[PDB]
Design a protein around this ligand. Structure first.
Ligand SMILES: O=C(Nc1cccc2cccnc12)C1CCNCC1
Lengths: 39, 156
């Protein structure tokens, strides 16, 4: 059995800890909703 | 239960202690999460109950109380913010330019930030704080690291 708790406002926050890259990946989506790298 | 717009943790007590299984977005009285978090199960808020209304395992999306509300899209250009809500830890914005899931059906936004599976459902925002989709469905790449789709549903 499962319950929710509020964790914040959804707001754009200027000067946030920028990170992460921008890969172009070749993927397949299966019937189960699971992505996979198509190679 | 609390209907206030904003982001929520999806908790269970079925396991040891209280475990954060995922995250969701409350907007316009509808709660938006990813299907793999709740499994389409009902939720509690105070002593209130949210019943599933829509869901689809392939899209990996589920709405509670009403239809999907979130119609905003990645512009294909601008950087985005993941409003990450990790287990045990406060809401953290982490700003990134999304990659691209190339599929036989079409190209999808992709954010490459690694976090525990319990972070599944946290929203990704545009420069106007509009939710452009949910973090927590994608793929482990060459590196052993994680890349998530920008998963958005269709409004009606
Ligand atoms: O990738 C998925 N789940 C995750 C979400 C967020 C972070 C993760 C980190 C490592 C591993 N998985 C993560 C999905 C789950 C349900 N569909 C199949 C893959």
């Amino acid at each position: 059995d499962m319950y929710i708790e509020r964790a914040g406002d959804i707001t754009w926050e200027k000067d946030a800890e920028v990170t992460g890259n921008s890969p172009r990946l070749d993927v397949a989506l299966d019937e189960s909703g699971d992505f996979s790298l198509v190679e | 239960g609390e209907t206030t717009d904003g982001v929520y943790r999806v908790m269970t007590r079925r396991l040891l202690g209280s475990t954060q299984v995922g995250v969701g977005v409350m907007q316009e009285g509808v709660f938006h999460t990813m299907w793999h978090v709740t499994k389409g199960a009902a939720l509690r808020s105070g002593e209130g109950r949210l019943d599933p209304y829509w869901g689809d395992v392939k899209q990996d999306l589920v709405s509670y109380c009403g239809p999907w509300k979130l119609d905003a899209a990645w512009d294909g250009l601008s950087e985005v913010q993941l409003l990450a809500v990790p287990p045990g830890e406060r809401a953290k914005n982490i700003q990134t330019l999304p990659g691209i899931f190339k599929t036989k059906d079409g190209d999808i936004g992709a954010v490459a930030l690694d976090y525990p599976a319990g972070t599944s459902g946290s929203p990704i925002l545009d420069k106007c704080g509009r939710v452009i989709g949910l973090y927590g469905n994608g793929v482990v790449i060459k590196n052993g690291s994680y890349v998530s789709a920008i998963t958005q549903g269709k409004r009606e």
